[PDB]
Design a protein around this ligand. Structure first.
Ligand SMILES: Nc1ncnc2c1ncn2[C@@H]1O[C@H](COP(=O)(O)OP(=O)(O)OP(=O)(O)O)[C@@H](O)[C@H]1O
Ligand SMILES: Nc1ncnc2c1ncn2[C@@H]1O[C@H](COP(=O)(O)OP(=O)(O)OP(=O)(O)O)[C@@H](O)[C@H]1O
Lengths: 564, 562
């Protein structure tokens, strides 16, 4: 419960206090109603049945109060569960765009996918489904044992000894199945990730004869999942056995104490008859708690996933804002060192780019020329250095002003499942239809509209898979051009576009009306057509820079790059 | 439901056995309460100690036996229905490996995960608890009420107040929650797809809009509002049912209907013992199905949704059953009805012949390569590999003839050896290293820390050119008679592209190749250049003949050279 309370909003902690008070009150009312039988039956079966009206009236008052407190506890539990759901999901949605790229390891991505996917009703109504019945069942036998003190001190104190064994059995049941449940969850998560991968790359698996379950990764994952699940089912038998034994031992203790009291004459026969009913009520929570152990363990796992996602490390950021909202900001690198793990990617990269120019970055694959644009865009951040936009370090910029000052054409153009216009519109959703049409026209997306039956309403699939590679690249370029960001980056310009579309898009990128600082990465000389400045990066260091014609005349490594 | 009953047909015997066993177990669990009723009657009658001790010990032993029997039955049923779930998941994973690949693109990965994993898990209550709980709810309330009628009809009829109220609450609950349960799996698939795109397309979310300006958060708010609307009256009805059928409510109703009868000269107090001891016992069993009809509805819908996938067209190998040859014949193909992407395309590869396929972007060359792969069946015409039609070749015998390099470099979560050796996992490490060296990637891999064992999952990926070189290494190691290169070396720089192209030419001197490329300067040496425009071949010939003709290829060449 410690991991859950920290997740509740500070708004709702008054509701949490109300919930806890009403839970205790409801348990006490239920225990009073259980033990109010003993005076009631003692008076009813005795020679004067008229003395049962008082206890019947008190029982009616107690059960009405129990109904009222239970409806109110249900309302508060539902509200708390959904408030925790909404706040946790919103915090995960707001935090993940700020989480460092290094955090999205395969296991961390699996945890994040599972945590967001745990937004269903299984977690929303967690309080009502788990915490209310669990606490009620846990505190009812103790509450009855305390209440039995009024009827008889030794009987009540003997009944409470049945709660110590209850807690012992609960702890043992949890700790015996802790390992098997963890392995079951691990295998289930691995199977989920393998199903997603299997359905996501069906082409490569099919062509490689690695799809059928006798030979595939999803098949091995399913076999391991089945083994872990059967082991878990086998390993939950000790929990049920221990709870049954605890209930039986509590019955033996209660029965022995009641028989001793009746034999000694301190307890009437009708009181013992009522104590049979009270014993039946006392024993029922032993079974109810045994039902909720798997639910409790799954809830613990889900909340650990959610807290792991909320604990992820966000990127460093400041509160500055760029001076030139519209004008072209100069992009500068000054001793920018970046590294993936122990691998050095950039070592002392230093280049100053004039505002408003068109800069070209070229070089062998694996050089680091997409990492330069990643650093300029702020997706990454230097390990030791300072990327400046118009003299202002990007690390100190507010995130909103950071993302409002760069537009990027990614190397692998991911597109969200939705209409084509919804993918282009994300570049600037408040943009007028004229701006969207101009952006589509520049990026040569008008060819798609005349070709596809639905025009710009055509639905793209998972990723950009329901369009050709060049078509989704052109949609990505349209998206990037639609944004009014003064800086424009291009990780790979026209990789999947034919010669005509490539030439048209290359003209359009340099011919966009507003002023911008344009950095473009390319592997073909036609796509750096009339670039003001050129940079050649070979192993994370700018080997040479200058004009295209100057580099060709110099005969350096840029000149022999295209000789082949 | 026809589909629901047809899916769970193997579990007919276990389901009926569980029903009968639970009919017996509820009576065994009700047995010790009758013994305690007799014990209470004898205590009021003052019987000797031996009878009381024998009845008490018999009641204790019988309730223990009933608990053990219920635990054993639930254990066995959970085992049977975990084995059934594993078998059904195996059947689904065998089905999906044969569906047309257009099935996956229009459904997504999140929908496939919901199918294989979440839907088959949704069957748990329908098969492990539905019939035991229904049989218990129809046996124990009925037997208890019949017995309490013989004990006393006045105090038995008042127990129809909570029972009838519970029935009305259960009926209105399920009627109101019927539609929302039907809408639930669609929302689960939508939310899963949005979460998957949110995590996969993280750079796009980061730059273009950020956290606040995202579709994922909008649909998250919509889903949470839907869950609130579904679960507020649902839990409201569940708690009212719990209050109606809890033991304390039955006990209070019994006492309110009995004390007026006992205090007045209308009933003996000894006849309240059956009602106090048994009359409160069947409340918890009624609630078992009250909380179960929702589970039965979800289970039946999940069964229907699973069986619908198991009834799909399956790319069946037909019963109609030169080396290195692929031979299209008037092929026409449509990804959707009335949307032709290929139009009467005829084309024949030959051994030791490098066919070059070029044309405008979106023309249909990658889908043509897919048709050669038989990811989809040609709507018309026929593709014949070694004379045999692809529709007659089995998958093992088909994909051992044709090796592929896809436009989208799709790496799987595993070591670099596990990706280069995807087609032939039994291949030794030296064969893998030879393939990698031929693909100009072995130099990169040795610089990584673990070497070839380094994992290639999300967040440990490579650059675009490097992963394309890995896929080229995979296709080279597969070593099929026919090779297809859908836009290979798009992201490769000229030096590495030249090196891997030379390696491919060395590795396919006598084998068949279908090179697809928009960089026409690499295509100039092709044996025949097939210009695919608008999904139909417009001209065929060598480089020089196509330039002399002055058509589409001349236009593309002029646009490229500038
Ligand atoms: N997620 C990652 N984890 C580890 N290393 C990475 C990751 N992404 C890229 N790298 C490494 O970064 C180095 C440079 O990557 P980058 O994306 O900058 O390449 P690039 O020069 O744009 O190449 P390409 O021409 O292939 O697109 C490569 O050696 C690659 O191994
Ligand atoms: N899953 C799909 N559903 C519907 N149409 C599709 C699907 N996948 C592709 N298409 C259509 O196929 C047509 C041609 O696609 P294809 O993948 O063959 O292109 P391509 O010639 O390889 O293009 P490029 O090299 O420019 O990427 C495009 O119009 C695209 O709309």
């Amino acid at each position: 419960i410690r991991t859950l309370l920290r997740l509740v909003p500070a708004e709702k902690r008054g509701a949490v206090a109300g919930y806890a008070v009403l839970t205790l009150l409801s348990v006490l009312l239920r225990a009073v109603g259980a033990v109010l039988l003993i005076p009631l039956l003692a008076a009813l079966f005795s020679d004067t049945p008229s003395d049962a009206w008082l206890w019947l009236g008190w029982l009616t008052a107690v059960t009405l109060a129990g109904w009222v407190t239970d409806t109110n506890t249900a309302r508060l539990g539902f509200d708390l569960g959904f408030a925790v759901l909404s706040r946790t999901q919103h915090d995960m949605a707001d935090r993940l765009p700020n989480v460092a790229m290094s955090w999205f390891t395969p296991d961390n991505t699996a945890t994040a996918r599972q945590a967001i996917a745990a937004t269903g009703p299984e977690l929303a109504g967690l309080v009502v489904n788990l915490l209310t019945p669990l606490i009620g069942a846990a505190l009812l036998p103790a509450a009855i044992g305390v209440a039995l003190l009024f009827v008889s001190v030794p009987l009540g104190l003997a009944a409470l000894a049945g709660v110590a064994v209850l807690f012992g059995a609960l702890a043992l049941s949890g700790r015996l199945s802790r390992a098997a449940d963890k392995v079951a969850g691990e295998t289930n998560s691995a199977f989920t990730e393998r199903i997603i991968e299997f359905a996501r790359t069906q082409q490569a698996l099919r062509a490689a004869r690695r799809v059928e379950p006798a030979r595939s990764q999803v098949g091995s994952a399913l076999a391991a999942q089945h083994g872990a699940g059967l082991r878990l089912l086998t390993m939950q038998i000790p929990g049920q056995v221990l709870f049954s034994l605890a209930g039986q031992v509590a019955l033996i203790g209660f029965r022995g104490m009641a028989v001793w009291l009746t034999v000694r004459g301190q307890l009437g026969v009708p009181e013992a008859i009522a104590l049979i009913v009270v014993l039946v009520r006392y024993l029922e929570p032993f079974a109810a708690i045994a039902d909720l152990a798997p639910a409790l363990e799954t809830t613990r796992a889900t909340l650990n996933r959610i807290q792991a996602v909320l604990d992820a490390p966000t990127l460093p950021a400041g509160r500055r804002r760029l001076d030139r909202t519209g004008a072209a900001p100069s992009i500068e690198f000054d001793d920018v060192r970046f590294s993936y793990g122990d691998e050095v990617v950039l070592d002392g990269v230093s280049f100053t780019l004039r505002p408003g120019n068109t800069t070209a970055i070229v070089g062998p694959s694996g050089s680091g020329k997409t990492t330069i644009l990643s650093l300029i865009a702020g997706l990454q951040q230097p390990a030791s250095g300072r990327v400046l936009l118009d003299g202002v370090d990007v690390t100190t910029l507010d995130p909103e002003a950071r993302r409002a000052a760069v537009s990027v054409v990614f190397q692998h153009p991911y597109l969200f499942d939705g209409t084509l216009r919804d993918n282009v519109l994300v570049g600037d959703p408040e943009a007028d239809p004229d701006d969207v049409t101009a952006a589509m026209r520049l990026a040569r997306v008008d060819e798609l509209l005349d070709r596809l039956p639905d025009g710009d309403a055509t639905v793209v699939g998972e990723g950009g898979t329901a369009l050709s590679g060049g078509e989704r690249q052109r949609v990505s370029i349209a998206r990037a051009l639609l944004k009014p960001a003064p800086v424009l980056l291009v990780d790979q310009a026209t990789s999947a576009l034919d010669n005509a579309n490539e030439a048209a898009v290359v003209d359009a990128l340099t011919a966009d009306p507003r002023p911008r600082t344009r950095v473009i990465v390319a592997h073909r000389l036609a796509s750096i057509r009339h670039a003001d400045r050129v940079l050649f990066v070979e192993a994370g260091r700018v080997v040479e820079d200058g004009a295209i014609d100057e580099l060709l005349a110099a005969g350096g490594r840029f000149a022999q790059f295209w000789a082949q | 439901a026809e589909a629901g009953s047809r899916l769970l047909a193997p579990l007919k015997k276990p389901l009926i056995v569980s029903g009968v066993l639970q009919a017996l177990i509820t009576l065994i669990e009700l047995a010790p309460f009758v013994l305690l009723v007799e014990l209470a009657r004898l205590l009021l009658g003052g019987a000797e100690a031996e009878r009381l001790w024998t009845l008490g010990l018999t009641a204790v032993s019988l309730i223990g036996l009933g608990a053990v029997l219920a635990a054993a039955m639930t254990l066995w049923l959970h085992r049977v229905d975990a084995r059934f779930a594993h078998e059904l998941r195996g059947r689904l994973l065998t089905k999906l490996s044969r569906l047309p690949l257009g099935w996956f693109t229009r459904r997504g990965s999140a929908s496939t995960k919901q199918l294989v994993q979440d839907d088959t898990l949704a069957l748990h209550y329908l098969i492990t608890h539905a019939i035991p709980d229904a049989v218990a709810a129809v046996v124990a309330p009925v037997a208890v009420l019949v017995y309490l009628f013989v004990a006393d009809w006045r105090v038995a009829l008042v127990l129809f107040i909570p029972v009838l109220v519970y029935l009305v609450l259960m009926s209105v609950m399920t009627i109101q929650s019927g539609s929302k349960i039907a809408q639930a799996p669609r929302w689960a698939e939508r939310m899963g797809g949005e979460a998957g795109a949110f995590l996969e397309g993280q750079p796009v979310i980061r730059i273009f809009g950020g956290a606040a300006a995202s579709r994922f958060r909008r649909r998250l708010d919509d889903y949470i509002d839907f869950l609130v609307s579904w679960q507020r009256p649902f839990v409201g009805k569940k708690t009212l049912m719990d209050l109606v059928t809890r033991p304390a409510t039955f006990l209070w109703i019994i006492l309110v209907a009995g004390v007026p009868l006992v205090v007045t000269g209308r009933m003996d107090p000894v006849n309240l013992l059956p009602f106090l001891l048994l009359g409160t016992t069947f409340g918890a069993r009624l609630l078992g199905i009250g909380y179960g009809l929702s589970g039965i509805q979800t289970g039946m819908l999940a069964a229907r949704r699973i069986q619908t996938v198991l009834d799909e067209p399956e790319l069946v190998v037909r019963d109609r059953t030169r080396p290195g040859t692929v031979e299209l014949d008037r092929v026409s193909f449509e990804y959707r009805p009335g949307v032709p992407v290929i139009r009467d395309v005829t084309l024949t590869l030959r051994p030791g012949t490098v066919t070059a396929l070029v044309g405008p972007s979106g023309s249909g060359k990658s889908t043509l390569a897919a048709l050669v792969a038989r990811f989809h069946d040609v709507t018309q015409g026929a593709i014949r590999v070694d004379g045999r039609d692809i529709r007659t070749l089995t998958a093992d015998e088909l994909y051992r003839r044709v090796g592929f390099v896809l436009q989208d470099a799709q790496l799987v979560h595993g070591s670099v050896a596990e990706n280069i050796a995807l087609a032939e996992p039994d291949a030794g490490l030296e064969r893998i290293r030879t393939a990698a060296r031929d693909a100009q990637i072995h130099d990169r891999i040795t610089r990584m820390p673990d070497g070839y064992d380094s994992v290639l999952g999300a967040g440990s990926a490579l650059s675009g050119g490097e992963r394309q070189r890995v896929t080229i290494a995979r296709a080279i190691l597969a070593d099929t008679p026919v090779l297809v290169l859908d836009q290979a070396t798009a992201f490769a720089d000229p030096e590495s592209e030249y090196l891997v192209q030379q390696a491919i030419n060395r590795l396919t001197r006598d084998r068949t190749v279908l090179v697809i490329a928009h960089r026409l300067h690499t295509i100039t040496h092709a044996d025949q250049i097939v210009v695919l425009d608008d999904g139909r071949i417009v001209e065929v010939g060598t480089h020089d003949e196509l330039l002399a003709a002055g058509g589409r290829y001349r236009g593309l060449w002029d646009s490229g050279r500038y």
